Scaffold this active site. Structure first.
Site, short mmCIF file in Angstrom:
data_model
loop_
_atom_site.label_atom_id
_atom_site.label_comp_id
_atom_site.label_asym_id
_atom_site.label_seq_id
_atom_site.Cartn_x
_atom_site.Cartn_y
_atom_site.Cartn_z
N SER A 258 0.98 -1.21 -0.14
CA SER A 258 0.16 0.05 0.00
C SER A 258 0.89 1.14 0.05
O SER A 258 2.12 0.99 0.22
CB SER A 258 -0.90 0.10 1.17
N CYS A 259 0.38 2.32 -0.14
CA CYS A 259 1.05 3.69 -0.06
C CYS A 259 0.05 4.80 0.45
O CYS A 259 -0.76 4.34 0.93
CB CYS A 259 1.85 4.09 -1.03
N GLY A 260 0.04 5.81 -0.02
CA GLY A 260 -0.89 6.79 0.26
C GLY A 260 -2.05 6.61 -0.68
O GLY A 260 -3.33 6.55 -0.40
N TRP A 287 -3.36 4.02 2.12
CA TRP A 287 -3.80 4.84 3.22
C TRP A 287 -4.82 5.79 3.02
O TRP A 287 -5.33 5.98 4.14
CB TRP A 287 -2.28 5.73 3.48
#
EC number: 2.8.1.1
Length: 304
Positions: A258-260, A287
């Protein structure tokens, strides 16, 4: 069956030169942080591209209807995009971006997830340019030099590739995320730790409980932003990243990246798959969706 392969510039020109059957359509997936005040579209059109490039609009070829950024496109948006760009199913798509494995992995992955048979992630355009690989330096007024095609994804791999919020949340709610998965967050450690803000105003930073910081940059060569070579290089890079960010990658656990927003998540996802980490999925919602759907209760700070 890899959704896309990394391809070095040399392998790429070799591929191009050797190709007798498949059209090779480099895909400029350049996408910039708005903070950079760059124009990916103008850059595609006016800055040298790999010859015969189409521009893959990371923004347009997404679920723009989603309240969450860079959400995987619907089959239709994707097919229409491919069609609009004149991408044929048989095209060898060689994805690159001008940043250096920034949006291109997302794009290569998107192409791959959407079942495009032959997708390469040029690794990467930076090196490609640095080492003066063939550039179409012509200014163009089209995001594709190809006539519109009728591209229709016959298969897609979202189920194998994309963790939905429901699963993410259940995994986290059940406290099984870290147990069942290597869950990596490609955001900066600061954002992961909640010590540094999200680029979004509505979203606090911090992380999904059970995730670990694997800032995507840690998995790319610092200057060239190339993915290290498969094997020892990526392993050295990966293990170093895992060491640096005090992360575990359990080879027995599938992986969620995942990331932002899900874009840089694919960077690390790709690095992990490059490293031979199996069953890496992207928590596409990432996120942003995590926070928006889960609220502050489900925001872990520091390394919690």
């Amino acid at each position: 069956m890899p959704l896309f392969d990394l391809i070095s510039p040399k392998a790429f020109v070799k591929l191009v030169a050797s190709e007798k059957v498949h059209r090779i359509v480099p895909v400029d997936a350049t996408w910039y942080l708005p903070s950079w005040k760059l124009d990916n579209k103008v850059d595609f059109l006016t800055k040298p591209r790999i010859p015969n490039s189409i521009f893959f609009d990371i923004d347009a070829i997404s679920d723009k209807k989603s309240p969450y950024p860079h959400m995987f496109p619907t089959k239709k948006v994707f097919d229409d995009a491919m069609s609009n760009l004149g991408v044929q199913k048989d095209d060898i798509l060689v994805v690159y971006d001008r940043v250096g494995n920034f949006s291109s992995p997302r794009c290569a992955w998107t192409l791959g997830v959407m079942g495009h048979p032959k997708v390469y992630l040029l690794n990467n355009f930076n090196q490609y340019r640095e080492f003066k690989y063939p550039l179409d330096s012509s200014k163009v007024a089209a995001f594709s030099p190809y006539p519109k095609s009728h591209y229709e994804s016959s298969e897609s791999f979202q189920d194998k590739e994309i963790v939905d919020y429901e699963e993410m949340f259940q995994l986290v709610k059940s406290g099984e995320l870290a147990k069942k998965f290597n869950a990596f967050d490609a955001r900066s450690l600061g954002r992961f730790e909640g010590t540094e803000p999200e680029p979004r105003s509505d979203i606090p930073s911090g992380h999904i409980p059970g995730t670990q910081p694997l800032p995507y940059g840690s998995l790319l060569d610092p200057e060239t932003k190339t993915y290290p070579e498969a094997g020892e290089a990526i392993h050295a890079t990966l293990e170093k990243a895992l060491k640096d960010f005090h992360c575990t990658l359990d080879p027995s656990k599938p992986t969620i990246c995942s990331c932002g927003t899900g874009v840089s998540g694919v960077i690390i996802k790709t690095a992990l798959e490059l490293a031979g980490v199996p069953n890496v999925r992207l928590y596409d919602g990432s996120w942003t969706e995590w926070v928006l759907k889960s609220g502050p209760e489900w925001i872990a700070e520091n390394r919690d």
